């Protein structure tokens, strides 16, 4: 349900995104900070995917910098989002009538980015305390959806999945398929370490990297050292 959305970590896995286009025509595929087509060329860190289900007309509310009921009481993306978005109109599965999809309706103040609020306590809209019983100025937060068929697209159920993946390649874990050639040294060679690209001469090095401390950098802020992924050596790019 939208008010308690799941979240699943992805790690240590060659991840392709070719497969997912094999779906019913996505009602939405936006990608906010990276083009969807070139998603098999990058190595990420800690890809995170978290999912829920909402109503039709509210799908355009899942985007940075918007306001509205879902966006301020149930789920809020931050302003500098960096990830993709999917939604694909499940009405063959989630409608019969169904009444175990829930969503919040009242709250004191808006959420904070990427925060889950799960509590079910009586909302108190007044100055006088409630003793856990509904009444005047004493309501219940949640409400059911009731997805019956033949409500038209506006009120029809909708699955949603959002991917957020931080994009500076700290020690990389998840990235798409690509072969691996034997590395050559002391020759001007096109290289592509884990996601970098460019030409240089890869040599041996004397620097010492801490276990968390993966690629070095220089004054003008350009990569000039790198931990080779398979054989964890330290190289110098010139």
């Amino acid at each position: 349900s939208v008010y308690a959305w799941n979240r699943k970590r992805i790690s240590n896995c060659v991840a392709d995104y070719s497969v997912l286009y094999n779906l019913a025509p996505f009602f939405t595929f936006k990608c906010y900070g990276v083009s969807p087509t070139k998603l098999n060329d990058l190595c990420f860190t800690n890809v995170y995917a978290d999912s829920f289900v909402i109503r039709g007309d509210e799908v355009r509310q899942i985007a940075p910098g918007q306001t509205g009921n879902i966006a301020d009481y149930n789920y809020k993306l931050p302003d500098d989002f960096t990830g993709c978005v999917i939604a694909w109109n499940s009405n063959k599965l989630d409608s019969k009538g169904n009444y175990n999809y829930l969503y919040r309706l009242f709250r004191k103040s808006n959420l904070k980015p990427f925060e889950r609020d799960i509590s079910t306590e009586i909302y108190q809209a007044g100055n006088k305390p409630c003793n856990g019983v509904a009444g005047f100025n004493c309501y219940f937060p949640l409400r059911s959806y009731s997805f019956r068929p033949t409500y038209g697209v506006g009120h029809q159920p909708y699955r949603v999945v959002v991917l957020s993946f931080e994009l500076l390649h700290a020690p990389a874990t998840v990235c798409g398929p690509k072969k691996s050639t034997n590395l050559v040294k002391n020759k001007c060679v096109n290289f592509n370490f884990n996601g970098l690209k460019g030409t240089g001469v890869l040599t041996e090095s004397n620097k010492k990297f801490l276990p968390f401390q993966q690629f070095g950098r220089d004054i003008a802020d350009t990569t000039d050292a790198v931990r080779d992924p398979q054989t964890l050596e330290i190289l110098d790019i010139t």
């Epitope: 309706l105 009242f106 809209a125 007044g126 100055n127 006088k128 009444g135 005047f136 100025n137 309501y139 219940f140 409400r143």
Partner: antibody, heavy 121, light 107 residues
């Protein structure tokens, strides 16, 4: 801060009537609206109340097969329908809601001007 | 069903005097919800003392209200010629929410 009600209207017995309550000047997404009928020179009588956002209703036992209190967020109004009118239903119908900005006012201190309906032939 | 018996029926002070009313109840009602109202003839009513002790906004300090449990009173300090109306007492603690009978204050 005010409620504006519909206008006077006379019906024949057996029909049904629909009354409406405007809302303007405050935050309506939290409040509740109740309906009170008063005949001429008599006491006040209760009918039922509705919470706006949730839509839940509650009714008096006597008014159990004749009232459908529904609202509409879009235009910010609350409606009431009375069915199978009889001679005893001729009175003045009021509409009240707490003042509610950030917090509600713990008491119905906004009262509409009241509308009249005469069941005659 | 809560039944409220507002007594006395009619009270007849001269202006400048001290007035009292009553809302004796059948069972007990939470003091959280009980309100007095003032109904001028030909008007909608208005809210005087909500919550059984607190005055509503924009109301002269003459009106007090008090009491809990099953007895609640409203006292007007001095009677000026615009306080002559009919006063109702309404509980909305538990369903149904029911009113009083009225109490006409005259000259």
């Amino acid at each position: 801060m005010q409620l504006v009600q519909s206008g006077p209207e006379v019906k024949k017995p057996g029909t049904s009537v629909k009354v409406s309550c405007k809302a303007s000047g405050f935050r309506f997404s939290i409040s509740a609206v109740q309906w009170v009928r008063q005949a001429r020179g008599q006491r006040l009588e209760w009918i039922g109340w509705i919470v706006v956002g949730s839509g839940d209703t509650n009714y008096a036992q006597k008014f159990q097969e004749r009232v459908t209190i529904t609202r509409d967020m879009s235009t910010s109004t609350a409606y009431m329908e009375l069915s199978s009118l009889r001679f005893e239903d001729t009175a003045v119908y009021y509409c009240a809601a707490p003042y509610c900005g950030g917090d509600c006012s713990d008491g119905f201190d906004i009262w509409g001007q009241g509308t009249m309906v005469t069941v005659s032939s | 069903e809560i039944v409220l018996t507002q007594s006395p029926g009619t009270l007849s002070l001269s202006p400048g005097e001290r007035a009292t009313l009553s809302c004796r109840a059948s069972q007990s009602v939470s003091s959280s919800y009980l309100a007095w109202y003032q109904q001028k003839p030909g008007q909608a009513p208005r809210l005087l003392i909500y919550g059984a002790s607190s005055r509503a906004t924009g109301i002269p300090d003459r009106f007090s209200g008090s009491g809990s449990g099953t007895d609640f009173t409203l006292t007007i300090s001095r009677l000026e010629p615009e306080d002559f109306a009919v006063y109702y007492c309404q509980q909305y603690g538990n369903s149904p929410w029911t009113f009083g009978q009225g109490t006409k204050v005259e000259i």
